[PDB]
Amino acid sequence: ADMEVIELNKATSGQSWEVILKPPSFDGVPERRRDPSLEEIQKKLEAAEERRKYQEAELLKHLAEKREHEREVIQKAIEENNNFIKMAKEKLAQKMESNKENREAHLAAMLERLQEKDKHAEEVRKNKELKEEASR
Amino acid sequence: MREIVHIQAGQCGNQIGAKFWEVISDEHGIDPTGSYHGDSDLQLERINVYYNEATGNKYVPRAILVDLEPGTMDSVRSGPFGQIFRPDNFVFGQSGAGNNWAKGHYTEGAELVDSVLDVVRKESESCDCLQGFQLTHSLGGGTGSGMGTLLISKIREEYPDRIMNTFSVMPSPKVSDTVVEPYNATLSVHQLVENTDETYSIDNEALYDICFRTLKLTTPTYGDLNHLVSATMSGVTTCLRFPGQLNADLRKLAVNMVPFPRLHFFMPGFAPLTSRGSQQYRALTVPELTQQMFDSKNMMAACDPRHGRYLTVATIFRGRMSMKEVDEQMLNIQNKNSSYFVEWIPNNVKTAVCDIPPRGLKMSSTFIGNSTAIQELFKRISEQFTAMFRRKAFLHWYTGEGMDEMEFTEAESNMNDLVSEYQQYQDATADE
Amino acid sequence: MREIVHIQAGQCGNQIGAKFWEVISDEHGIDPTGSYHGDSDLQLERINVYYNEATGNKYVPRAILVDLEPGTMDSVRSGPFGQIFRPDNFVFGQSGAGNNWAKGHYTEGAELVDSVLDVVRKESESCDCLQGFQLTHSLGGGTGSGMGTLLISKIREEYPDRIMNTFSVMPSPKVSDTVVEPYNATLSVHQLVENTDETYSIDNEALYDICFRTLKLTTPTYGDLNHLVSATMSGVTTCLRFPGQLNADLRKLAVNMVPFPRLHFFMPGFAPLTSRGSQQYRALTVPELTQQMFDSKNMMAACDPRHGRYLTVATIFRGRMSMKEVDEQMLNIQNKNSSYFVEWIPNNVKTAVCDIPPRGLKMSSTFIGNSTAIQELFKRISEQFTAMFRRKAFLHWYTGEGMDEMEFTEAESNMNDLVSEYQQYQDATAD
Amino acid sequence: MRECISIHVGQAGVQIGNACWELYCLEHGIQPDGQMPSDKTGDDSFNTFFSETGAGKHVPRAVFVDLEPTVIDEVRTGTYRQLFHPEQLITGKEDAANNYARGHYTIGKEIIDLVLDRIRKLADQCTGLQGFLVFHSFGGGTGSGFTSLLMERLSVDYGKKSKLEFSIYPAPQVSTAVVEPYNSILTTHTTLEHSDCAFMVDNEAIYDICRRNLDIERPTYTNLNRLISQIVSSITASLRFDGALNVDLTEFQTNLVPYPRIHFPLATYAPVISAEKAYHEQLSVAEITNACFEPANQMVKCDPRHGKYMACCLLYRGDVVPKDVNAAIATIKTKRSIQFVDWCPTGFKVGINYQPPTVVPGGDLAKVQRAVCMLSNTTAIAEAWARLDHKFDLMYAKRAFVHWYVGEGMEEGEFSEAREDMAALEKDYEEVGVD
Amino acid sequence: MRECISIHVGQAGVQIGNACWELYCLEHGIQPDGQMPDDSFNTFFSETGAGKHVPRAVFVDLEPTVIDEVRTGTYRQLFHPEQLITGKEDAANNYARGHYTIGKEIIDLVLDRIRKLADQCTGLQGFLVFHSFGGGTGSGFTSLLMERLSVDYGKKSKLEFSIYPAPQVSTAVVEPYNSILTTHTTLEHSDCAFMVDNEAIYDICRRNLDIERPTYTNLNRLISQIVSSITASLRFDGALNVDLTEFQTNLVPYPRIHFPLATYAPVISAEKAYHEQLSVAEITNACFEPANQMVKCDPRHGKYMACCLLYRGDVVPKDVNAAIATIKTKRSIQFVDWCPTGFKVGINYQPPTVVPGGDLAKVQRAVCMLSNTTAIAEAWARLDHKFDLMYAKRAFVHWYVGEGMEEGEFSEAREDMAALEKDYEEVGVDS
């Protein structure tokens, strides 16, 4: 049964007013940060850019570490093949020289044996010389 | 975020890659000569994502074809859409990797790598706004695997701000082409965990099982398995290829799918499952399409999604259907199966509807899930690797290339940690 | 490995050597003038092994003919194939050794030796690839024996890398009454043990026994005995003389036959046994050849192979026959008789088949065995030597030439060790 | 003269701007080429939103910004390409990829000086600039990140100049990113001290009004935006016509904002009637006023019964009379509580704008003789912050997706700061309600 | 461009090379003058300005006989004279002569010729070495060459085609010695060796091709066919290819365990005609049956560690995978536990070519399986036992010692064989 009507404004394409059903139970109206700074904003935007960039450079640092390891495995495979060649060359020369030595020694021993027989024979021949003519 | 640069490495990479290019060309109305002959402006709106426009009317795939073996390169040119590729974009060596990851990653692959980066820099510098890279390869061989991961690493160095996406095919004894696949896969996974943003885990075990069990093919061939791959590849790339709101670019997709950097291995799903020769078919309703999300039988990775929990899911519906029905069915699937969706990632299932169905079907559905159940795929590789490594079987082929046993131990350890991390999130509760 | 240089020393050496040259010339189609008149390219493929080619057409034996006695020379020139030999290759002394090994080895033989080396150096240096030497001689005489072994030693000194092969004929009281033969033989064996690579032990005791018992010849002559030698010599050299896979050269043969250096004395065997220039009609079957060639009655050394064990065996089949049959028969013989083959030398029996049979037979078989039973031949020479040496009988024949008793003692000891070594391998078990 | 500059950020902000400016042109009789039969003989209030050129052309006092060109390219090629000068349509090449840190820290830095230069140029043409109206999404990387960057700078360049918002509150039905609660809390924290009055538009509330009142099975952005524009028009009508209430921007803050941080008024609109339906009897002033007190008509999903009013404004449009309005307010107080806080009088500030409600010809909305928008500052709006804060907490406890923000140069500490500020805001609404 | 250099050592190596190169010419349509009216054949044949195709091969023998037949034969114009190398004197079935004494004289010459062939290679894969275990040249000279190739070419791939000795066709008693010495010496220098047991081939020729007494020509024609299957993946571009490196990687789990077993099917006689056409399943199944093996051993009592299937002719991947699926279901075919099973499949379009007038039938499809099974150790054990039997008595050792070799080399070689035997035993056990 009660309403307070307060006319506010009237214009060409409008009219306004306030309707009050009940006043505030509590009287005495209610019961802030500047500004910000363009510099403060820039400092924070720049800090975020340096973080993005730091981590991008870190990721690149590890990819570069993968690249160095790659050249390292290529180098290991190259090094092992070179050592395989060097081992084989020396084991083979050792084998060819030991067998030359041995084959020469056998032929020397067997020629010495035949030459010893030759010495014994002229000696046998010499003893017949003390028998033949040197009698009758 | 316009252009994507596509790379095909090794036999598997080129076979699956060729199939992708022929499938999407038909979807965008491009004939093998590169000319547009379609009848929908929707086919050309986002053509620039995968194709460059050459002299006049012609469209040329932004694809780089790579192998250490010259053979596959002839096999591609000779293929259905073989003449569509840029001739200068074919980079092939003269001596294959011999199914050795070490040869692809450190020896022969390393020798061919700079020639590949030259072709990719040429394509990349022509871009107005390069999204990133899409690589198709297998993890079981030497080139796709070893050289493929070497490429990713070299690309990551030159283009660190771009998205690295892969279609990585996982080996299986059921359809194996080398005895050393467990080694090549473990060494590759290790690289993928560190250097890719998103990887579609395409498991040959899952593909074989679908062909044998579901499609009733007694003796499946690579052609049968690749028919499922091409369907999947077409489905997962739909949102990038056509106008839409959801996962419209590689970065937006990564942001929705990847909650933790190392957990970027997706379990793809597809419905309906069909055989190359299955030219029937007259079927599949919206509830029928939706039910398949939890259907382990439709997973392109040999993991049971009911054995884990979804961190995130992207669902793509293709054909003329009610979006209302789609939304209702998608909500019902999430409420009825709340135990397989982590509670700590609210609204983790995103749905998209493309009016254009793929050729053959009037209606289809593609699922892209980041599920903790993918740990099953890694455990299977790990056990196979261990069975061999324990005995140092075939190890002299890798050490012969200059590798140390420590790299094997490291790759194994990293993969075991990845498994351990998935298990950690599977067990995590929203007790918060 | 093409050329072989052949040496003939003394009476026996020249008679057996002449017979060899006439037999092989007929096998290669060479007439007594040296001209080839055969009708098979197989006869000439390996003709360079024993012959030199001279002035067009003609083929000349790479043979050196030696004796301290001028007689045998005339006897050879006058023989069937006598005119085929190089005239300059005849080296003859004037004295003769008088059945004295010391005269042949240290005296008259030593004076003639350099003239022989002259002719052998000439033949050897003409060779593209010299295999080695083949010497025919007896061990019982003075020249073939003493000078023969002196030759081996001198040639070995100049050609140490070559194979030294001999056809050494062993003495027997049954054929020669010369009482000093065990001495000459023992002194020669001693030299052969140290200086040859391979020796074919041709025993006159075995030759006599075959002629008397098998051929029913009451009084066998050297012609009868030499007919078995020539058969054997033709058989054992077939693999050197014609294209083939097995023991095609002297070194390859030595490598297959000789497991221990000193054990290089072969027991040759032959089937069928025949008398001189006699027919014929009916040729042995493959099982007959396989059985007959392995019998004690078919051995050219007076030893029973069943009394020992084979270290190694080379078997040569000549004539048109099934290699399948030959292989089956050869396997059956070594499975049925496993106790006569040492278990510790696996696959020790090697077989060869030559399509060309020798003259007279349609089919033949030659056996070359390295058997521990050869110790029986050495024990027989040793017992004879001892019977004489114990009493110092005839020692002054040799001591007169400047020799000492010690050489006799040494030669004896060496031969007793050889016997003792064969016995050691006979008793050796695989386990 | 009292000019207002409108700023549209990201896809949501741009697409809503399209709907708003299309509607303003219909309301002021401006054709899409910027021509208006200025052949009047009058009310020149439209000049607060449209400047005039030497060709007799009317150009919106607005700037459209996006970190990607797709959406704005449709404006430069569309029906209204001649309405805007190319210089006022700003685009980058790569978007903020649904990442607040990307839009604020990374990409934003590239285009900020350019946007401020254009704003400065539009402000240079103002004889009595009131301030800014900023339209953006809480959810996207541009709407969230770029907006907070812009608001901070506008406070530097235009110290103590009014800044009002029209913010799109995220709904899962239409959501494109799992990280939308993160971007929402990060933007709210950053913008809080820089905004004078923000009018949140909950996409689920709009989606449900379109579904229920407009019989649209699956509502599209075009459907949502036409509806949002009707409310934006109701709020901006006394600035663009010779009105009496909310006559200047300062009056929004005075009439609705008792404390600087509690600046989020709830909007309620009626009637929303389907165009494609049977001829019905026109709704009275009582029927439309009653509808202001129905939660189903709200622009944000919350329950005013679980709160207290601190300020109320009723903005009527069309064939409306004070007697009918006062009688309508009288009958409501009889049957309802309508609880105001201790320190505020229980009442209403009422405005009648005689300019009839306008609808887009061929749209989903029915043209009505009379309509009303209620602007009320209620403590119930805190329920919307709580729903967002809970989703944030669920993900943040696991650090899910955080690596995306950290990768762009943001610190984990920023997520905590933002959340603590939200906790304070929630506590502020609780404290303000008390007595 | 992916070249492979073939080296043929001694008689066995040369004669197999003749059979191989004759067959390759038929397969690639190359006439015996090197003229021809794909492209991959260029890995095995270089081209001259006159349009002539010359094998990327060297033929070496210490004697000229065998290679002289090449220089006078049907394919005399196929090879340049410089790639056919011969000495004068063979190694006489003695490893020491092949390796040292005689070998040392021709080694630098052989390496110079291989250097010249390697100079014409833009992408050399490695070497294929064909030789016997038994001969003095095949054993000794090959070891010397292998060692020398490791010096000149380091780790560059070296694969062998080795003839494992059989008594039926054996020419020397010392073949087990030469086998063990060559295996010891070559072990660390070879990447993958494909052994061919002569008794297995002899029995396939007898039992399958109805040949009463098989000759080297018969054995060789069959061997060549297996060699052609192994090399076709390199000489043609088929459905599925495999290179030198891919062989090593799929067949060799440990460096010493490099001896795959080869099995070939089908081997059908030129008679019957009804005996086909055999299916992919029937031919695959035949690979796990012992009668078709190249080495006599029992896989049933061993474990597979790696399998490679080389198909040729009218063959399809679906037919092959279906056949492997059944092999995978067979409990009687055991794989080691440390293996994912592993099946390396190669498929080439060309049906197996036969020599006109040969013993083999024309087949529409054929397959060669390369399996690394622990059962191959049975072949080493058989050789090691024969070695032990002779070595316990030092039989024939004086032949090797005479050439400058020491008894220590024999012990080292045998100890290495004992270790290899132990290695196969260790690899077979589960962890």
Ligand SMILES: Nc1nc2c(ncn2[C@@H]2O[C@H](COP(=O)(O)OP(=O)(O)OP(=O)(O)O)[C@@H](O)[C@H]2O)c(=O)[nH]1
């Ligand atoms: N689904 C499917 N899988 C394939 C296909 N080809 C190969 N694979 C798989 O990929 C692996 C072998 O990878 P490859 O591409 O063949 O090896 P590569 O890259 O060519 O390396 P190299 O041949 O050594 O130079 C195995 O795990 C196979 O299961 C294919 O066409 N389809």
Ligand SMILES: Nc1nc2c(ncn2[C@@H]2O[C@H](COP(=O)(O)OP(=O)(O)OP(=O)(O)O)[C@@H](O)[C@H]2O)c(=O)[nH]1
């Ligand atoms: N089978 C065989 N034995 C013979 C022949 N001539 C001699 N003998 C034997 O050989 C030994 C005698 O050897 P000879 O050749 O005559 O002696 P030599 O070598 O000529 O030396 P001297 O006469 O002492 O100058 C005795 O055992 C005789 O039985 C023969 O033609 N055939």
Ligand SMILES: Nc1nc2c(ncn2[C@@H]2O[C@H](COP(=O)(O)OP(=O)(O)OP(=O)(O)O)[C@@H](O)[C@H]2O)c(=O)[nH]1
């Ligand atoms: N009402 C309405 N909401 C929209 C519209 N477009 C996007 N949204 C909502 O806004 C949020 C997505 O943020 P957007 O404005 O599209 O993204 P953006 O500001 O362009 O930022 P980025 O694309 O990440 O650079 C989701 O909650 C959408 O549902 C639109 O036209 N109308």
Ligand SMILES: Nc1nc2c(ncn2[C@@H]2O[C@H](COP(=O)(O)OP(=O)(O)OP(=O)(O)O)[C@@H](O)[C@H]2O)c(=O)[nH]1
């Ligand atoms: N399959 C086969 N085996 C052969 C052939 N020739 C010889 N052999 C075998 O190889 C071994 C003999 O070694 P060879 O190759 O003939 O001798 P070599 O390498 O010439 O060595 P030397 O002659 O001693 O210098 C025995 O096992 C023979 O059976 C052949 O053409 N084919």
Ligand SMILES: [Mg+2]
């Ligand atoms: Mg390949």
Ligand SMILES: [Mg+2]
């Ligand atoms: Mg006399």
Ligand SMILES: [Mg+2]
């Ligand atoms: Mg956007």
Ligand SMILES: [Mg+2]
């Ligand atoms: Mg030879």
